[PDB]
Each structure stands twice: as C-alpha cells, then as structure tokens.
C-alpha cells in the first residue's frame, strides 16, 4: 500500500504512460546515473511497487537488490496498464483487450 513509480528508459514511453495514467508518477532513465537517482527516489518516497519498463537486465537486478523493492518488469503497454490498476482499484481508464 503506497506509491507506484513507473520507470522508463525513453521519453516516448514516459509521455505515453503519463498521458494514459496521470494517477501514477514516472521516472526517466537516459543514463545509469538516472537509474541511481531512481534507487534513491524509491526509498525516500517509500515506494514498495516499482515498474521497470523496457530497462536493461543489469539495471533491472540492480534497482531490485539495492532498493529492496517489488519490481514489475514490463515489455508491453498492456503489462504496465494492469500494474497501474493493481494499485488503482477505482481505475479512471479502460485497458484495451487483445486476441
């Protein structure tokens, strides 16, 4: 029970998630220096649930172990969409269904 931080490696992914979900906070990682700023950001905000969208595996396991938090490894929009609804019971959107 707390904040959901969506961490992205690309501005295109950031502005996407922020438009779809103004109800979550998003961190941009262009270099590992920003990923370190994420490790700090998490602990200072007290974030238990942290999404890692399109990140490197070295950065995945690194943020995981050092921040000591639940990592949601996202490779598709739909995955992120479900993780947001996990924290946000009363969702303000409609997740698109695929087949």
C-alpha positions as a LaTeX table, in Angstrom:
\begin{tabular}{lrrr}
\hline
Residue & $x$ (\AA) & $y$ (\AA) & $z$ (\AA) \\
\hline
Unk1 & 0.00 & 0.00 & 0.00 \\
Unk2 & 1.80 & 3.15 & $-1.29$ \\
Unk3 & 3.15 & 4.92 & $-4.42$ \\
Unk4 & 3.56 & 3.24 & $-7.85$ \\
Unk5 & 6.65 & 4.56 & $-9.72$ \\
Unk6 & 6.80 & 3.71 & $-13.46$ \\
Unk7 & 10.46 & 3.81 & $-14.57$ \\
Unk8 & 11.12 & 4.13 & $-18.34$ \\
Unk9 & 14.34 & 4.37 & $-20.38$ \\
Unk10 & 12.75 & 6.51 & $-23.17$ \\
Unk11 & 10.93 & 9.92 & $-23.33$ \\
Unk12 & 8.45 & 8.34 & $-25.81$ \\
Unk13 & 7.50 & 5.71 & $-23.12$ \\
Unk14 & 7.34 & 8.41 & $-20.38$ \\
Unk15 & 4.91 & 10.82 & $-22.12$ \\
Unk16 & 2.82 & 7.74 & $-23.11$ \\
Unk17 & 2.34 & 6.41 & $-19.51$ \\
Unk18 & 1.81 & 9.98 & $-18.11$ \\
Unk19 & $-0.96$ & 10.68 & $-20.70$ \\
Unk20 & $-2.70$ & 7.29 & $-20.18$ \\
Unk21 & $-2.32$ & 7.44 & $-16.36$ \\
Unk22 & $-1.97$ & 10.92 & $-14.65$ \\
Unk23 & $-2.65$ & 8.88 & $-11.43$ \\
Unk24 & 0.96 & 7.41 & $-11.38$ \\
Unk25 & 4.43 & 9.08 & $-11.18$ \\
Unk26 & 7.06 & 8.29 & $-13.91$ \\
Unk27 & 10.92 & 8.43 & $-13.75$ \\
Unk28 & 13.09 & 8.83 & $-16.91$ \\
Unk29 & 16.45 & 6.96 & $-17.16$ \\
Unk30 & 18.73 & 8.13 & $-20.03$ \\
Unk31 & 21.96 & 7.04 & $-18.23$ \\
Unk32 & 22.63 & 4.72 & $-15.21$ \\
Unk33 & 23.15 & 7.97 & $-13.19$ \\
Unk34 & 19.34 & 8.45 & $-13.51$ \\
Unk35 & 18.81 & 4.76 & $-12.52$ \\
Unk36 & 20.82 & 5.55 & $-9.32$ \\
Unk37 & 18.55 & 8.62 & $-8.80$ \\
Unk38 & 15.66 & 6.05 & $-9.09$ \\
Unk39 & 17.21 & 3.73 & $-6.38$ \\
Unk40 & 17.27 & 6.79 & $-4.04$ \\
Unk41 & 13.85 & 8.16 & $-5.24$ \\
Unk42 & 12.09 & 4.88 & $-4.36$ \\
Unk43 & 13.46 & 4.64 & $-0.77$ \\
Unk44 & 12.90 & 8.38 & 0.03 \\
Unk45 & 9.27 & 8.23 & $-1.30$ \\
Unk46 & 8.81 & 4.81 & 0.43 \\
Unk47 & 7.77 & 3.01 & $-2.79$ \\
Unk48 & 7.20 & $-0.77$ & $-2.43$ \\
Unk49 & 5.93 & $-1.29$ & $-6.03$ \\
Unk50 & 8.25 & $-0.10$ & $-8.84$ \\
Unk51 & 7.63 & $-0.77$ & $-12.55$ \\
Unk52 & 10.70 & $-1.17$ & $-14.84$ \\
Unk53 & 9.50 & $-0.62$ & $-18.48$ \\
Unk54 & 11.99 & $-1.53$ & $-21.27$ \\
Unk55 & 15.05 & $-1.41$ & $-18.95$ \\
Unk56 & 18.38 & $-3.30$ & $-19.23$ \\
Unk57 & 18.67 & $-6.61$ & $-17.22$ \\
Unk58 & 21.80 & $-5.26$ & $-15.44$ \\
Unk59 & 19.71 & $-2.21$ & $-14.31$ \\
Unk60 & 16.68 & $-4.47$ & $-13.52$ \\
Unk61 & 18.50 & $-6.68$ & $-10.98$ \\
Unk62 & 20.47 & $-3.63$ & $-9.69$ \\
Unk63 & 17.43 & $-1.45$ & $-8.79$ \\
Unk64 & 15.76 & $-4.68$ & $-7.46$ \\
Unk65 & 18.51 & $-5.72$ & $-4.99$ \\
Unk66 & 19.83 & $-2.26$ & $-3.89$ \\
Unk67 & 16.40 & $-0.52$ & $-3.41$ \\
Unk68 & 14.97 & $-3.84$ & $-1.95$ \\
Unk69 & 11.53 & $-3.45$ & $-3.65$ \\
Unk70 & 8.97 & $-5.31$ & $-5.80$ \\
Unk71 & 9.98 & $-4.92$ & $-9.48$ \\
Unk72 & 7.36 & $-5.22$ & $-12.27$ \\
Unk73 & 9.32 & $-5.98$ & $-15.45$ \\
Unk74 & 7.24 & $-4.54$ & $-18.34$ \\
Unk75 & 7.96 & $-5.13$ & $-22.08$ \\
Unk76 & 4.40 & $-4.27$ & $-23.42$ \\
Unk77 & 1.93 & $-1.34$ & $-22.75$ \\
Unk78 & $-0.73$ & $-3.85$ & $-21.57$ \\
Unk79 & 1.55 & $-5.13$ & $-18.73$ \\
Unk80 & 2.07 & $-1.58$ & $-17.35$ \\
Unk81 & $-1.70$ & $-0.94$ & $-17.73$ \\
Unk82 & $-2.51$ & $-3.93$ & $-15.42$ \\
Unk83 & 0.16 & $-2.96$ & $-12.80$ \\
Unk84 & $-1.41$ & 0.55 & $-12.57$ \\
Unk85 & $-4.91$ & $-0.95$ & $-11.98$ \\
Unk86 & $-3.38$ & $-3.20$ & $-9.23$ \\
Unk87 & $-2.64$ & $-0.07$ & $-7.12$ \\
Unk88 & $-5.59$ & 1.96 & $-8.52$ \\
Unk89 & $-8.71$ & $-0.11$ & $-7.68$ \\
Unk90 & $-11.04$ & 2.60 & $-8.95$ \\
Unk91 & $-9.42$ & 2.98 & $-12.39$ \\
Unk92 & $-10.06$ & 6.19 & $-14.40$ \\
Unk93 & $-9.40$ & 4.46 & $-17.79$ \\
Unk94 & $-10.23$ & 1.37 & $-19.94$ \\
Unk95 & $-7.38$ & $-1.16$ & $-20.68$ \\
Unk96 & $-7.59$ & $-2.37$ & $-24.35$ \\
Unk97 & $-8.19$ & $-6.16$ & $-24.91$ \\
Unk98 & $-6.05$ & $-8.12$ & $-27.47$ \\
Unk99 & $-6.70$ & $-11.54$ & $-29.17$ \\
\hline
\end{tabular}
